[PDB]
Amino acid sequence: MKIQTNAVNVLQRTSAYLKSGLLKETPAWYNVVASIPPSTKFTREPRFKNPSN
């Protein structure tokens, strides 16, 4: 499945609604999500050692 973009950018899409005026009132989650950014790299990471042996 394609790496989704719209689930981790809710804050940025919401900020466009608020700046334009399409959304009058800031949502309760808005400040919380801004202070705790989601991880959005979704990369494959190399590994250089077998932790068991």
Binding site: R13, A16, Y17, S20, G21, L22, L23, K24
Partner: protein, 294 residues
């Protein structure tokens, strides 16, 4: 209970006092009244029956089965109005229903704004005042069924605030094209997105985007260049707030797919200078803007 004439004479009219006196001399005070559970003679509410109600009682002077006047002594000589208007307020408007006094005064934008606010929480004022709607495709489609060909109206519209926010909406209706446009306008507001704009006038650089069979080649332009692009792209740029743009469409020129491709290109194929700078850890300077700076 039997009451003295004095008390009864302060509440009931003189004409009815004789009847009350005779009833209090024929019905013993120790009468144990019983309730009838077969025939309901009295109304379901309390009433002394001393006043004639203008609606719930027969109209004085009107002919009817129980009229007590002689046939030559009726007092209804005008028949152009309803004799007994409804009681109380004068209406029976169901609770929660409004009298249709005014018709045809609705604004479809206000109808879209009210519905979307209730369904999604968007501000009605922004929709009805800040947004501009432009139909892009309006055609009739048809489905072949056993009964016969069923026609439908298809409408593709674009909405935008001319300040970065633009949306594309589609709508279908078997009844009329106006209903299809209403649905498309409704859909377009729900799909509103922000598009990056360089200096709020153009796009960042050039875009070569493929949307299905449509090849879109869009180039940024100098201030005052104007919109020199396919007519479908022109309308979208107008709503979105793009003023300067050049471009050419190759291969498929299907209006529907040009519009969707353009919206997709403006979002998925652009990168702001700020986003490029942060990703690469470099400073990007607009030479033309610095030349005119302090």
């Amino acid at each position: 209970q039997h009451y003295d004439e004095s008390l009864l004479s302060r509440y009931y009219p003189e004409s009815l006092l004789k009847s009350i006196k005779l009833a209090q001399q024929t019905i013993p005070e120790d009468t144990k009244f019983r309730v009838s559970r077969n025939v309901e003679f009295a109304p379901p509410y309390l009433d002394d029956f001393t006043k004639i109600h203008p609606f719930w009682d027969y109209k004085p002077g009107m002919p009817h089965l129980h009229a007590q006047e002689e046939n030559n002594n009726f007092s209804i000589f005008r028949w152009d109005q309803v004799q007994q208007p409804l009681p109380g307020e004068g209406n029976i408007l169901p609770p929660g229903v409004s009298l249709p006094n005014d018709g045809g005064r609705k604004s479809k934008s206000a109808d879209v704004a009210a519905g979307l606010h209730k369904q999604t929480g968007v501000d009605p004022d922004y929709i009805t005042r800040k947004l501009t709607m432009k139909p892009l495709v309006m055609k009739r489609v048809s489905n072949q069924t056993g009964k016969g060909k069923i026609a439908s109206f298809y409408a593709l519209v674009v909405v935008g605030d001319k300040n970065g926010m633009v949306g594309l909406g589609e709508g279908k209706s078997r009844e009329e094209m106006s209903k299809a446009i209403f649905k498309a306008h409704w859909d377009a507001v729900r799909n509103l997105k922000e598009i990056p704009r360089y200096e709020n006038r153009t796009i960042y650089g050039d875009i070569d985007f493929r949307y299905h069979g449509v090849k879109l080649h869009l180039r940024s332009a100098k201030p005052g260049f104007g919109l020199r692009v396919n007519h479908v792209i022109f309308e979208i740029c107008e709503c979105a707030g793009i003023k300067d743009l050049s471009g050419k469409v190759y291969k498929s020129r299907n209006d529907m797919n040009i519009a969707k491709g353009t919206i997709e290109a403006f979002t998925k194929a652009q990168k702001t200078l700020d986003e490029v700078a942060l990703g690469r850890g470099k400073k990007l300077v607009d030479v033309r803007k610095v030349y005119y700076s302090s």
